[PDB]
């Protein structure tokens, strides 16, 4: 798994864009939050990645301030984001081309990591693709998800924009 993800390294925010806290589950490099990171101060962000090469990369950028994000290895189905990340403290959680990623039997593994993070009333912005190494999303097997792991859905729906899905999930 991991190994195909630190291969590629040698899918971006579309308009998804006050004390905000973040996390960024699968930064990436962090082309699209840096510069949002920049633009407003207030932002602190939590920025995970699987690849560790990756993580070089983060760092790497001019961008990469160390006082308003702190970016660290993990991998959500089996590292736990407590770790690095504070109980119930995250404002906003980012799942952005990052699920399908994952395999659909540990998918779950990081619904339940990040819903630690996440205040109770914060929700997770969602970004991924749908149907009507990845795996597409139907809007209903998603929202079940979601369910599965506890969160309640806001806003799901296909994108015609191949298929997108834009999908906003509250955590009680
Ligand atoms: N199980 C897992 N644990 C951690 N990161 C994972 C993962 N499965 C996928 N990823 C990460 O998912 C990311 C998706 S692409 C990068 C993010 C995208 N540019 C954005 O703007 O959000 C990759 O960086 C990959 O390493």
Redesign the pocket.
């Given at each position: 798994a991991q190994k195909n993800?630190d291969l590629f390294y040698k899918?971006?925010?579309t308009t998804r864009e006050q004390k905000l806290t973040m996390l960024?589950?699968?930064?990436?490099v962090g082309?699209?939050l840096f510069p949002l990171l920049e633009e407003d101060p207030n932002i602190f962000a939590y920025a995970?990645?699987?690849?560790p090469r990756?993580i070089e990369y983060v760092k790497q950028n001019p961008l990469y301030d160390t006082e308003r994000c702190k970016v660290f290895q993990?991998?959500?189905?089996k590292d736990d984001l407590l770790d690095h990340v504070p109980p119930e403290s995250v404002d906003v959680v980012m799942l952005?081309?990052?699920l399908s990623?994952?395999h659909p039997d540990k998918m779950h593994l990081?619904l339940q990591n990040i819903y630690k993070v996440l205040k109770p009333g914060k929700s997770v912005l969602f970004r991924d693709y749908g149907l009507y190494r990845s795996y597409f999303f139907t809007d209903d097997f998603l929202a079940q998800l979601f369910m599965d792991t506890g969160y309640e859905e806001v806003v799901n729906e296909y994108v015609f924009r191949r298929v997108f899905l834009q999908s906003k999930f509250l955590k009680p």
């Open positions: 993800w899918r971006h925010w960024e589950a699968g930064c990436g082309n699209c995970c990645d699987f690849s990756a993990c991998d959500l189905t952005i081309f990052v990623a994952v990081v």
